[PDB]
Amino acid sequence: NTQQLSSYAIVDYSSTMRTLIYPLGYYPLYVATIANDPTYRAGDCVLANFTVDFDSADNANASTNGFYVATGAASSPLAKYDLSYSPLDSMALDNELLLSGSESALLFSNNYKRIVVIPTFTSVLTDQKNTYIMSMDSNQEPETVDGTDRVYTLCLRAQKREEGKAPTISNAMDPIAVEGGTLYSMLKGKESAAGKKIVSYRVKYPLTFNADSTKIATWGYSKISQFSIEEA
Numbered sequence: 001n002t003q004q005l006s007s008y009a010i011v012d013y014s015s016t017m018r019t020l021i022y023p024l025g026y027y028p029l030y031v032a033t034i035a036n037d038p039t040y041r042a043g044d045c046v047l048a049n050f051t052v053d054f055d056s057a058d059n060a061n062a063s064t065n066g067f068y069v070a071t072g073a074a075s076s077p078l079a080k081y082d083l084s085y086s087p088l089d090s091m092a093l094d095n096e097l098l099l100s101g102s103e104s105a106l107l108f109s110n111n112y113k114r115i116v117v118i119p120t121f122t123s124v125l126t127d128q129k130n131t132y133i134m135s136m137d138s139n140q141e142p143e144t145v146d147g148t149d150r151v152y153t154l155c156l157r158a159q160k161r162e163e164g165k166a167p168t169i170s171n172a173m174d175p176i177a178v179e180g181g182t183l184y185s186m187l188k189g190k191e192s193a194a195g196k197k198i199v200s201y202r203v204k205y206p207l208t209f210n211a212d213s214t215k216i217a218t219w220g221y222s223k224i225s226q227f228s229i230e231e232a
């Protein structure tokens with residue numbers, strides 16, 4: 001009868017100050033346990049697991065309420081980063097790490113926008129901690145990528161902050177949240193002026209170093225991610 005989903009989501013207030021979760025690809029949800037949990041605050045991103053009972057008395061007026069009542073739980077909030085408009089060169093950062101993936105999506109809520117990005121690593125140690133820099137060149141002209149026109153490129157780089165310990169974890173993922181509000185406003189302005197209804201972007205990341213690890217030699221790229229810039 002009921003089916004569980006897991007989706008990244010933003011915690012936020014509705015227009016009447018109810019705490020809801022706004023999952024990527026789903027409707028807004030009221031989860032009473034999350035709304036009363038001091039681990040969270042509006043603007044946080046989480047991985048939520050939830051179930052909606054479409055036949056409940058609480059969901060009889062969901063259309064007028066503007067949310068579904070759901071049960072579930074969520075992860076700890078994702079680490080938060082700014083989106084930097086200071087592009088970097090190929091020189092390696094201190095304690096820089098190579099990545100093996102960086103899929104992402106722009107999430108929307110009532111009051112916030114966040115890019116959720118999932119940097120992946122060939123290997124990490126248990127309890128390793130990283131910090132990140134998401135940057136881009138605001139003067140860049142978008143380009144055609146694999147048949148998609150006007151694709152913008154963001155860059156994700158990582159630095160090791162804590163070494164961690166054995167055992168080694170392969171193909172480790174470290175979901176993070178990046179501020180998306182000013183990126184959205186800027187790309188909406190550029191792409192609406194170009195007569196477009198969407199924005200297309202990808203995330204590049206370091207794939208290999210040069211021989212002495214002083215520079216990035218090659219880069220990897222995420223799949224293209226898109227979001228609408230049409231509003232009500």
Ligand SMILES: [Cl-]
Nearest residue numbers: 074075076077
């Ligand atoms: Cl967690």
